């Protein structure tokens, strides 16, 4: 799992993208790179023991509609170190870094009942009090809560479900 080796490439690529302001374009470039890594015929090649130069240039020939100067050179660095499989994780961490820089957050709202638009509106306002970032609410419907709303801002969770209140009470006794 490449969670720990993806950070340097994500950070460096994001800083360079910021200096040249084409952050959205860089995200497109990385999305394209992540999808070619999932291909059945490429995922076989990436596991073979080819020398980095040959392997990279095959990938670069396949990777049309990227910028030679910058994006394809990121590809070269990752090929040297044998880390092209880190691209599906470098993409996620680049998106995280962008969300942090743009002071914008994505959070999930979960309930057994489909929420009314006024409920979602007040949720967004309250969350923007709790969180400095603006919030994009994601609606998930799950009968598990049985009632109430589960607020899931990533690792930070506020539980407002009856079932949670019940299984919390059961351990008090």
């Amino acid at each position: 799992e490449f969670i720990t080796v993806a950070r340097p490439y994500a950070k460096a690529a994001f800083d360079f993208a910021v200096e040249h302001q084409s952050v959205e374009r860089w995200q497109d470039m990385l999305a394209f790179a992540a999808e070619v890594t999932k291909n059945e015929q490429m995922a076989e090649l990436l596991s073979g023991a080819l020398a980095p130069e040959t392997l990279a240039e095959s990938f670069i020939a396949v990777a049309g509609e990227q910028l030679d100067e910058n994006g394809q050179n990121l590809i070269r660095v990752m090929a040297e170190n044998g880390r092209l499989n880190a691209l599906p994780d470098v993409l996620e961490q680049f998106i995280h870094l962008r969300a942090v820089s743009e002071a914008t957050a994505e959070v999930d709202v979960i309930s057994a009942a489909a929420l009314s638009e006024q409920q979602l509106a007040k949720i967004s306002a309250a969350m923007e009090k709790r969180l400095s970032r603006k919030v994009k609410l994601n609606a998930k419907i799950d009968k598990s809560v049985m009632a109430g709303v589960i607020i899931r801002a990533g690792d930070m969770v506020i539980d407002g479900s009856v079932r949670g209140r019940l299984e919390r009470l059961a351990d008090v006794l």
Binding site: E1, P8, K11, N70, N81
Partner: protein, 512 residues
Amino acid sequence: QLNSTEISELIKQRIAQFNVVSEAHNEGTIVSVSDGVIRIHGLADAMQGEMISLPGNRYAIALNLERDSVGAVVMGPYADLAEGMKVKATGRILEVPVGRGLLGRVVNTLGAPIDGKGPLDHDGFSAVEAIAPGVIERQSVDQPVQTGYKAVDSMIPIGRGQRELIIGDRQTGKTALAIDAIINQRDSGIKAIYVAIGQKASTISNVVRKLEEHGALANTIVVVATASESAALQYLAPYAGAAMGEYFRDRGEDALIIYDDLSKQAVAYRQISLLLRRPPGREAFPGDVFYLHSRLLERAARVNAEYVEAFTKGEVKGKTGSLTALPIIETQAGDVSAFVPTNVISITDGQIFLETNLFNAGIRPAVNPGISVSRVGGAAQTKIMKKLSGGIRTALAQYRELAAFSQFASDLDDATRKQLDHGQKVTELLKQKQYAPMSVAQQSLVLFAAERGYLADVELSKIGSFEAALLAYVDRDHAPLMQEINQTGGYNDEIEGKLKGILDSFKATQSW
């Protein structure tokens, strides 16, 4: 899954331009500092074994050349360094001041004066790492190196160009024996070098004081790497001393180098290796620890006169040079099975074993005759000493065996009794006090008295006083013969008759 010094701003630099410009391959930047090892990024042209210059006036040795990294060890106080400092590779391997003017000085392993007597008056510089003379450039060792201790000079001869291991436990007299051997060369024409690895500084001050009380200091170079100095300096300290010894060897002169605690060098190379993350071996020592001591000790050689003429470009003709090595090793409670002792025992030309059970029973110096051997043989002795010493070695081994056998048996037989109380008396005879080295005439005289049975009727406690009285009597009455033996080492029926007369006249007319 691990990083490899791929870090954010370096990656951003490569993102801007993958084929980063040539710039200078001469220079780079420190990226890590720890325990005296630094990692450098850049230095595309750094050679393996090359000196890297650091801010201030400090250096490092490039030991690991890896894929976009150099591992280097710092030859001094490292803790002042920091990440992001620039460094430049020299063109230079490590070299040290060398010459005749080093005699009487105390220097560190970089050759800087440490005694405070002012700057050096050396004769140029020599490489610390160098190759030994080849097979066709050697000559057989035949001249003696006179130690001054009866047991050593009789049973375990040391010749010019020999490598003789001194091995034993802590506090067994190893340092004292070596330094007394230096003192005996005070008037021998052999230059002496004492290199001290990992010892505490005041001990070095104390031995230099003893070397200064006697006249030996004006004939020796002292090279010091104290316990506070970095492992690189301790590890490189023996080779600098060897590079100073090779100056005299390559110019047709004789030198004696005393490496002190070569084991405290091996610990240092181990520290460097494990800090540089190389694969460990037995007792966690690096695999190439044999190669370290092997390429150090093989520099001790005798070189033929044609090599000396070829080297000195004909300035010195017809004289062989020599470098004699006396390494010192410490055993953990005497177990020869340990890795470093077994390697150094494999490399050397002989072994002097010093035992604490002998040292505790009054037998000082505590050399064990049964397990101590010399490969050169009597070929490194003067001929008078050769005759007399031959019998001594066998007699001592056989005496030990007989002593055990006949004591627990609590028994007697006539010839065995005679042999046993001759062996006890010669064993008592080889005891000797510190800083009292004997000339070859004195040694041969006492050994003649022992071999020819004049001690057969002296009681054991009076052997020492017998020896002292004999030496004083001879030093007043028969000095021309002592001068002749000391000048020639010859042995004739005339010499034997005169020695017989001396012993007869002494034992009749004197008392002890």
